[PDB]
Amino acid sequence: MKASGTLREYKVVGRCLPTPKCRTPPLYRMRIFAPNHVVAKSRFWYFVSQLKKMKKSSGEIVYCGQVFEKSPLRVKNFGIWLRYDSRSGTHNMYREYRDLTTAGAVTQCYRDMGARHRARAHSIQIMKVEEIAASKCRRPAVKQFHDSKIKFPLPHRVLRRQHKPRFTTKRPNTFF
């Protein structure tokens, strides 16, 4: 899987193909984060196969649909439990993020895992994603934004319109 663009959260439900032994095999559900639904079903079959004696040939997808963020206008803290392969082992991490959507938080995890650990998306398994209250967060990067009277300036604002104009008479001012 390529963690392309902003991921979506998919609810994938699958089961073993019914057989005379078991005419109604049990139903399984997973939370999948993927770029599109085609990738979402593919990853499902990759995960259930690791937990059950099942695979695409001997099973079917019963429901694939996007789970929509339920409070897209409310800031939340997300705890993420993931495992990943490094160059020389596997590890379990717990990570935290602040975001408005749970799929946005998961995307941050992939970019972050790529930035800080050079971990490609194909080597990352998001085990669990929870919304966490400010009092249960652990990472100081997230906790410093739990301040009702938070304030801070924007020092040294760099000129981003550096080629409009490309040549000017006045030098830029970085203080605002």
Partner 1 sequence: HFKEANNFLWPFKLSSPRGGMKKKTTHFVEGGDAGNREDQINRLIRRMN
Partner 2 sequence: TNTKGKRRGTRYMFSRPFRKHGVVPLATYMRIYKKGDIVDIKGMGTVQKGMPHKCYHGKTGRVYNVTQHAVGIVVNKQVKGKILAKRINVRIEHIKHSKSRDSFLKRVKENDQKKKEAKEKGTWVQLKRQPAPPREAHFVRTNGKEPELLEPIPYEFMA
* Contact footprint for RNA (CB under 7 A): 1, 42-43, 45-46, 49-58, 85, 87-88, 118, 120, 122-123
Instruction: State the nearest-atom distance from the C-beta of 24 to partner 2, in Å.
Output: 7
When asked if residue 22 is in the footprint of partner 2 (CB under 8 A), the reply is no
**CA neighbours within 13 Å on the CB side: how many for 21?**
4
Phi/psi for 32 (5° steps) reads: -120, 135
Helix (H, G, I), strand (E, B) or coil at 44: helix
Q: Which residues contact 78 (CB under 8 A, 6 or more apart)?
A: 96, 97, 98, 99, 102, 105, 106, 129, 130, 131, 132
CB 110 within 8 A of CB 99: no
When asked if residue 131 is in the footprint of partner 2 (CB under 8 A), the reply is no
Chain positions 41 to 70 lying near partner 1, rule: CB under 8 A, are 42
* 66 contact choice in RNA, partner 1, partner 2, none (CB below 5 to 8 Å, kind-dependent): none
The residue ranges that bind partner 2 (CB under 8 A) are 13, 15, 24, 26-31, 47-48, 50-52, 60, 62, 81, 83, 90-92, 125-128
